[PDB]
Amino acid sequence: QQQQLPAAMADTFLEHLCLLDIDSEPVAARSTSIIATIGPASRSVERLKEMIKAGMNIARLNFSHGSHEYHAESIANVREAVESFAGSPLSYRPVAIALDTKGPGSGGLSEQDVRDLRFGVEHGVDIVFASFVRKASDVAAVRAALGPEGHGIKIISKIENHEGVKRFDEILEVSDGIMVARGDLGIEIPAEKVFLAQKMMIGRCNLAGKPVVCATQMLESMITKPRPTRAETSDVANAVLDGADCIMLSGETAKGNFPVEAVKMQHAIAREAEAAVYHRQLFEELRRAAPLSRDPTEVTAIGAVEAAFKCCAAAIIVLTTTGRSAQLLSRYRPRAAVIAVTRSAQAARQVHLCRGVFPLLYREPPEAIWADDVDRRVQFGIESGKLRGFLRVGDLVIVVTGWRPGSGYTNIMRVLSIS
Amino acid sequence: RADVAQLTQELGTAFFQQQQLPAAMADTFLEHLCLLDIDSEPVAARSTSIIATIGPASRSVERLKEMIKAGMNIARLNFSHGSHEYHAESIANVREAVESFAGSPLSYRPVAIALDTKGPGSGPGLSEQDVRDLRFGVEHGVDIVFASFVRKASDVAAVRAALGPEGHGIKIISKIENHEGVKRFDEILEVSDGIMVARGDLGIEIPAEKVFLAQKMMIGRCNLAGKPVVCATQMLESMITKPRPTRAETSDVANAVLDGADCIMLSGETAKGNFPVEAVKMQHAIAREAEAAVYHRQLFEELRRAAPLSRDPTEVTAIGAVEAAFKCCAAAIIVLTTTGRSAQLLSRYRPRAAVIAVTRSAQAARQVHLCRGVFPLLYREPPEAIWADDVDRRVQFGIESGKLRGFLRVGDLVIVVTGWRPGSGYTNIMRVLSIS
Amino acid sequence: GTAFFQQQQLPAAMADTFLEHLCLLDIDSEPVAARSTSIIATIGPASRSVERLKEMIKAGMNIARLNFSHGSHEYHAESIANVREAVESFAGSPLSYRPVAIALDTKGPGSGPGLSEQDVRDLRFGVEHGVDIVFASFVRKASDVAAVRAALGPEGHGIKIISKIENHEGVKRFDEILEVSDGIMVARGDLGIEIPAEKVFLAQKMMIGRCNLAGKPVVCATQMLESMITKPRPTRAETSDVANAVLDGADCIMLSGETAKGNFPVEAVKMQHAIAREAEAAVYHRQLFEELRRAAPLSRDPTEVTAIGAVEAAFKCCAAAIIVLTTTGRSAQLLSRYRPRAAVIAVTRSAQAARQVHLCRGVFPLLYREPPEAIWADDVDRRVQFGIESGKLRGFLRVGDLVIVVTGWRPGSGYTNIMRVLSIS
Amino acid sequence: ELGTAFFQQQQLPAAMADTFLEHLCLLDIDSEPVAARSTSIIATIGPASRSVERLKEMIKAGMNIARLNFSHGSHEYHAESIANVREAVESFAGSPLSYRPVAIALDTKGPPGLSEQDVRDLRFGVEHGVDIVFASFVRKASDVAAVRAALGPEGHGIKIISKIENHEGVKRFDEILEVSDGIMVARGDLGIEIPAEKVFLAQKMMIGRCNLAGKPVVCATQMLESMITKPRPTRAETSDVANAVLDGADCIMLSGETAKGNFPVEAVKMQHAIAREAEAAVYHRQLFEELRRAAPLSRDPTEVTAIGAVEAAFKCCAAAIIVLTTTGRSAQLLSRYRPRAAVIAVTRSAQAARQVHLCRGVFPLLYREPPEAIWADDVDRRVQFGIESGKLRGFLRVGDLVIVVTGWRPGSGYTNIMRVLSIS
Ligand SMILES: O=C(O)C[C@H](NC(=O)[C@@H]1CCCN(S(=O)(=O)c2cc3c(c(O)c2O)C(=O)c2ccccc2C3=O)C1)C(=O)O
Ligand SMILES: O=C(O)C[C@H](NC(=O)[C@@H]1CCCN(S(=O)(=O)c2cc3c(c(O)c2O)C(=O)c2ccccc2C3=O)C1)C(=O)O
Ligand SMILES: O=P(O)(O)OC[C@H]1O[C@](O)(COP(=O)(O)O)[C@@H](O)[C@@H]1O
Ligand SMILES: O=P(O)(O)OC[C@H]1O[C@](O)(COP(=O)(O)O)[C@@H](O)[C@@H]1O
Ligand SMILES: O=P(O)(O)OC[C@H]1O[C@](O)(COP(=O)(O)O)[C@@H](O)[C@@H]1O
Ligand SMILES: O=P(O)(O)OC[C@H]1O[C@](O)(COP(=O)(O)O)[C@@H](O)[C@@H]1O
Ligand SMILES: O=C([O-])C(=O)[O-]
Ligand SMILES: O=C([O-])C(=O)[O-]
Ligand SMILES: O=C([O-])C(=O)[O-]
Ligand SMILES: O=C([O-])C(=O)[O-]
Ligand SMILES: [K+]
Ligand SMILES: [K+]
Ligand SMILES: [K+]
Ligand SMILES: [K+]
Ligand SMILES: [Mg+2]
Ligand SMILES: [Mg+2]
Ligand SMILES: [Mg+2]
Ligand SMILES: [Mg+2]
């Protein structure tokens, strides 16, 4: 069987490793998002279209380099390349725009960061990767600089030094997610300890149900060479096996000679690594560690993920306004793809931060009766699923909806047979 | 502590001290035993059904009303004794006592009627007396048949044939009473609705010191198959003459419930003993204590690992509903069911939450007592013009009855299990509702 | 051979879950191992004759309980003499001799706060007559155990004190009582009157689990085979109660009226023996050993470190037995706490230790009577050979079996530190 | 007692966790490694690492096995490299605290059958007393039988580590492992023969199967590749070394990093530093439980004693397991259970001392004293030699507990005793 299913049925982690097979082909869609840094090698609209097709989900703008005019042109080219595929709504792929700050240098929040954060809000960025976060008040300062119009922007705190690692719990508590920024971390702490910080932060983010990004030098040699080293493919695979929600490309896409090939390589590795995850242990541990809850979205999410594993569901289709119901399903790491149907273009972009969430932006005319409108969004999730290869006739899907309009009311799970 | 800290702040430390919840959160079975507490009071309604044999000591309508109030769920008629006229009178008295509570539909308790056959004796097949007794059962509308000395699958096919076309709905519980029945258990279970571990004859047919092995094996296999299993005979034997049982008898009842039995039975204790009502009360009190002492964490994990993957939406919905109920400490799972099957599939996962089964079928309401933790509510209202409105009314009946009976309080979370179209076999929906 | 793997519930033993272990239990899978749960029989008019006592020792009685709630000191001194005469009648065959402990069960405190004056006199009688164990009635707190220990005086330091938990206070103060006691008795008779009868199983399971965690003996007592006081065969609930006490983890099971005053004393001992043997094979060792290991704290005591290594080695090779040399019984007790499937054959020169180790599940005491060899290593080896020859005569061992041998580096108690894998020749 | 400081080091809070997820959450960059580095480092000897002075620095940095790649150079060139390795190793014989055996491994050029060049290179290996052969492109069991036959009448004690470098070797892995002494995951060729994105699956599978079989497994190629020209490795390279150790590799290897790069000693130091951190991060609670469950029951006393000794070592946090071995087999059977305690192997065989570097956590001590007339006295002198070397090296202190593994009679194959000793 395909997708490492013989290894998935093993009774121990050791026997699971023994049953991994190079001939067992991945079938599921790639779950881990790829963040590509936009720079001179990846700015053109033509190049960006190839990167979107290769698998890029989030475009990162590094505000340590370039100018506001330079980054505004990069953003416009990304949006032009993304919108060139809007003519086919059943296959359109949203792409998030993330702003990576310069940081505080030797100083609180720098004056350049205040200006760059204002630029981000004015240009409608979806995410901020806040550099050198060392305490909870650093996150509050970034949040205040985003102003009242930036309330919806996700703040991903970059842990880059000893203090950020030691104050991790307080930083995670007030952040939307974390970035393990291994470049600076490997200079701030002994290089041989970075893997411990990475594994600990990934484990704690998985426990909290918050996104974690593994970043820097994942495919470094691909800046000048067409193929990566054996250590680089292993590093990407191990970040996915560790539990990372996203993987990142920096120089490989910003300035390298093979930007599209680097995206394709991360895509190919992530797909193979996701099938090699030992879900039997992972799901059991995530389920046991997740606290008891009286929030109906939290209760519906665990019931839906348990139902999906019971029937080998091809997908969990969820309606979401903010992305929260999809995120609560994602935290249990289902093998079934989480297809998130939303009308919010921003939520569709932001939900790429959560592993295994495939956003579908709903642009069909509204139905007069709310129950009919919900049913047509579910049929849209199914038709997009069929066109993209997620679903076939005869598959079982789990459908997650709410009892009334508006965010916060998810409380229903349904088992549906396709066609 | 982090996995229960926010819910402990919300529900309070008193909530988490009751119903053996500190033992329930233990990481190993050994730690679970160490945390069992005689001061941790049971809160949940008693989920293991009590089968009481009706005889001279428990035949009067007034006595039967006391037995229904004490906890009797199934009335057993032993066709090894008495006559058809005698058993017909016992059935009529049971129905009169049961119907005396029908005036309040929100609190009415259905009681099943089970016929226990005499058996084949030295003969190889279905005896002539069994054919007549089975015909009597169909004519008197019995809900269940406890078939004596089942030794192979063809014995149950013979009982099924003798029930005729009008007895298709009657549940057949095969009694395993000898070495052959134990050895051919898998084939017998496959064609039966459930099993009875008939320890009286089993303890004479096989060495007495081996009966506990047969009991534990059959209970484990029935739990794995999701089929009811009854533990029977000499559970509270000394209560035939004494008002209080021995230490071995209370332990035996508690251990049958901990083994996984769906029902426990009283024979001479209710049929001829001096303390029939007290015997029912004692089984009720022990079963409530033992149900709270079940280590659900291991049981649910093992039922998931052992159960094969399923593409039946009723089965997929049932595991999702039970998982959701454990996540929020749901007070109940309300399920709409025509035949009892959706309630049975929830029951096989052994939820701690009560399974309140709302049905229009009076027979299904009586028969679901065979499944652990299923509380039947008989809905008597005529159908609404719009099917979705009729579904909603039945769910509200379950909620309002749940509040009236003490199962539910304002602020509780309940899991609601329904289907997408009318008729049996279409359960596919799970909803989380907050009680207001 | 394939026959080996069909016996002693070995298909159920290899199951991956407790549920599948239950599903694989087989009434045709015969027990092979020797019965490991000790039987305590209460002495009375039905079991006091020397000839009847010989039959009870052959049926499996390991501990004789003297109930000091009945009879004078003169009655109990005769009971002691008769027990010793019956036990010593088998001393002429040292390879088959079975030690039998004598336990004194006190009358209790009554309406008083703690140690009654009658208990002080009974305890002094126990020391003067050399009893091995005291079952202290109605223990409610740690100071009750200290009072029993003080009443035993300086000459009774070696006597084991088993605290009987018989009321709500003893259950609530269980941890402090267990800490100062050598073991516990779940006295279900009084417990079932002091607390609601439907809660006794919770107290029994909790106390057995905590004693197993602590590595201290626990006795399940009262009305286990009650109907056998007058009837030749027990009820279905009684056989199930005995089997479930063994499956719960009890080290000993007890008979009271069944052996003291009933008409079937020998048959009651035989019935407990037959049930315990079937129940011990049905224990799911895979989960039990895993949980005992995880719960047991780290240790720097070499006896404890050797014991866990020896039990792990025994499971790896399906050892027929673990033979241990012991002066006080402590090395055998530390092996027993890990619940090996292999029998723990304890070879000792101490007649008292040989009697007292019956409190520990799976310990088979052998009393070595030969004078010491001049070379200490030769004395150790002769004792190990005595364990092997006793084991072969009694059916524990055959040629070709593997056995784990546990010894120490110097004479005297407290120095066990060696484990060795030995092939039986 | 041990103190609270003891329980804060070597990731002991993460070691006590009840789940793998909790274990990851408790990993701490401030919890310092204390145990000696247990994963062996294989360094390829070439132009950048051939001189006696350079080899002395590589031995001090942590090199345990010297690899000679017969795909390059000549017999004369490799004979000079072997002589320089032996000269550098023997320069530390004057101090027990610095002397360390170093194995010599011959890596063949590769292949219808065994090539003429491989036959001659294998003969060169036997004549020069190599300890190990890394056999290139092993595709089936008969390839290993051909290498074994070419090792001739004198080289039957040489360990054959089969290099799995293509699709066929991966598919016929079980039959190859059965007849080999160990495996090398040769990722360079493997990443060209199969899709590059599948190499991690083959690596994890082969490591898991070798751990299950109790046979050494080497992770090789491009582990610290950028260190050929740069003084510090990339983030992906440090992670790759740490993950090979966490996967269960017995050895890690350096190729161009030591053979031709500008920083050979620094590459060895980097592998040493990462392996030490990664070994403390292994979740022993699950690993030991799974190795125990997957391993079949055994009636071999060495195997039964090994599991009892490893269980005893975990129970008391033993500083070391001292084992007397002539062939290395008793040390290998302890190593397969992955104890946290160091396995100090006392042997009179210089070849067994070099070869046990293939087994994770085995620290060989070569013993050269003349045999005592009373065998029990000869055994006691070797046990005390292991203890005094352990005290001198920092493994042991007075008051520590050690597990000692011996047999009941002389000769290899009789290990059946485990003892708990308090260090005095
Ligand atoms: O302290 C510093 O000076 C910088 C520091 N380190 C680095 O950025 C690394 C070293 C430099 C190269 N990069 S890179 O290749 O990933 C990279 C390069 C570029 C851009 C990036 O975003 C980017 O990540 C631009 O955006 C851009 C824009 C306009 C012109 C050129 C460029 C460009 O070359 C890695 C940091 O980010 O804090
Ligand atoms: O498929 C092949 O072509 C054969 C294959 N080679 C490679 O692919 C490797 C990758 C490129 C570089 N390395 S290297 O830097 O590690 C390497 C280089 C050299 C030596 C090595 O051992 C060695 O591994 C010498 O021993 C030596 C001796 C004398 C002169 C020069 C040298 C020398 O340069 C070799 C193999 O050896 O398996
Ligand atoms: O994931 P979120 O943000 O809570 O959104 C979930 C919400 O989406 C719905 O399914 C559909 O709501 P809308 O019709 O307003 O889009 C609600 O019933 C539910 O509360
Ligand atoms: O448990 P059963 O027998 O399958 O009945 C479940 C059925 O009950 C319902 O919830 C309601 O059906 P009715 O309206 O026919 O009573 C169905 O949607 C579902 O299929
Ligand atoms: O179990 P205990 O009382 O600690 O006795 C174990 C002792 O028995 C021995 O094996 C034999 O000692 P003796 O020769 O004194 O009987 C000692 O080596 C060991 O210390
Ligand atoms: O690991 P190996 O090669 O089997 O060697 C273990 C052998 O070493 C010993 O401990 C000591 O043997 P020698 O005195 O011959 O060295 C033997 O008793 C045991 O059989
Ligand atoms: O800023 C970053 O991404 C880093 O340092 O790794
Ligand atoms: O028939 C019965 O119920 C029995 O034998 O137990
Ligand atoms: O004293 C006892 O043995 C009792 O009360 O059970
Ligand atoms: O030969 C090797 O070492 C390789 O291919 O990795
Ligand atoms: K930046
Ligand atoms: K009958
Ligand atoms: K008494
Ligand atoms: K080579
Ligand atoms: Mg940085
Ligand atoms: Mg019968
Ligand atoms: Mg009493
Ligand atoms: Mg190669």
From TrEMBL, chain C:
It comes from the Eukaryota. Residues 305-422 form the Pyruvate kinase C-terminal domain. It catalyses: pyruvate + ATP = phosphoenolpyruvate + ADP + H(+). The keyword Ligase does not apply. Its EC number is 2.7.1.40. One of its GO terms (molecular function) is ATP binding. Residues 35-269 form the Pyruvate kinase barrel domain. Keywords: Allosteric enzyme, ATP-binding, Glycolysis, Kinase, Magnesium, Metal-binding, Nucleotide-binding, Potassium, Pyruvate, Transferase. Its cofactor is K(+); Mg(2+). The keyword Protease does not apply. This is Pyruvate kinase. It comes from Homo sapiens (Human). The lineage of its organism: Eukaryota, Metazoa, Chordata, Craniata, Vertebrata.
